[PDB]
């Protein structure tokens, strides 16, 4: 590992600096180094890891969508033949995206998930596993597409089962998991009814638990609840 010689604490410090500088590739590389030290991650550290990779892969996804749209248009009737370049470059971006996903899934498998015993860590990591399989599913067109989809579903479902048993309905990790699994249903699994049902039930059960919260917890939970509402508005 390129970060093998740097102190864990220095990697974490530099990840925070990279975030301030909006250097998300660096942030992700620092956090990968920190994970590879082999110690469990704190709440804050888990969120540094997720922020870094979310931003990297988010940029790749946006680029992939631009290129895919161009490619699709090139394959319409009446479109002039422009050669292999659009496909090649879409493939290049796709391969890099798949590489980042594989990197994240690799960290989760070696060995973040197996050492995560508390609900807040285990659910967080299983949500990440679902998310990165979902990103693989977005670009999948081959023999393994169904298996990739099922891998996302399975990770999300395990996270959901733990979250329902172990966390209150307003817990932000539980809420974010449900938000994203709902999107999985809508966008990946061709299950819009399941997506809508999950978002609605999640919202309503959270609403009923807000009375238990401090002002600060209320703010956190209601922010994610609004995202559930936004998706419901988009879909209905």
């Amino acid at each position: 590992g390129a970060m093998g010689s740097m102190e864990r604490a220095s990697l974490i410090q530099k990840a925070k600096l990279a975030e301030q500088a909006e250097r998300y590739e660096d942030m992700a590389a620092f956090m990968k180094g920190a994970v590879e030290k082999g110690e469990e991650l704190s709440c804050e550290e888990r969120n540094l890891l997720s922020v870094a990779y979310k931003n990297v892969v988010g940029g790749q996804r946006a680029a992939w969508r631009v290129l895919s749209s161009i490619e699709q248009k090139s394959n319409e009737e009446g479109s002039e033949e422009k050669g292999p370049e659009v496909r090649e470059y879409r493939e290049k971006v796709e391969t890099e995206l798949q590489g980042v996903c594989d990197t994240v899934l690799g960290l989760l498998d070696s060995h973040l998930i197996k050492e995560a015993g508390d609900a807040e860590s285990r659910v967080f990591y299983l949500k990440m596993k679902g998310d990165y399989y979902r990103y693989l599913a977005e670009v999948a067109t081959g023999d393994d597409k169904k298996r990739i989809i099922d891998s996302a579903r399975s990770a999300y479902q395990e996270a959901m089962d733990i979250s329902k048993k172990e966390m209150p309905p307003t817990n932000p990790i539980r809420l974010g998991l449900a938000l994203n699994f709902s999107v999985f249903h809508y966008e990946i699994a061709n299950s819009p009814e399941e997506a809508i049902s999950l978002a609605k039930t999640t919202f309503d059960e959270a609403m009923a638990d807000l009375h238990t919260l401090s002002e600060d917890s209320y703010k956190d939970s209601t922010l994610i609840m609004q995202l559930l509402r936004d998706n419901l508005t988009l879909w209905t």
């Binding site: 938000l179 809508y186 966008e187 994610i224 995202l227 936004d230 998706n231 988009l234 879909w235």
Partner: peptide, 5 residues
């Protein structure tokens, strides 16, 4: 696109 976190 829909919201995720």
């Amino acid at each position: 696109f829909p919201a995720t976190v």
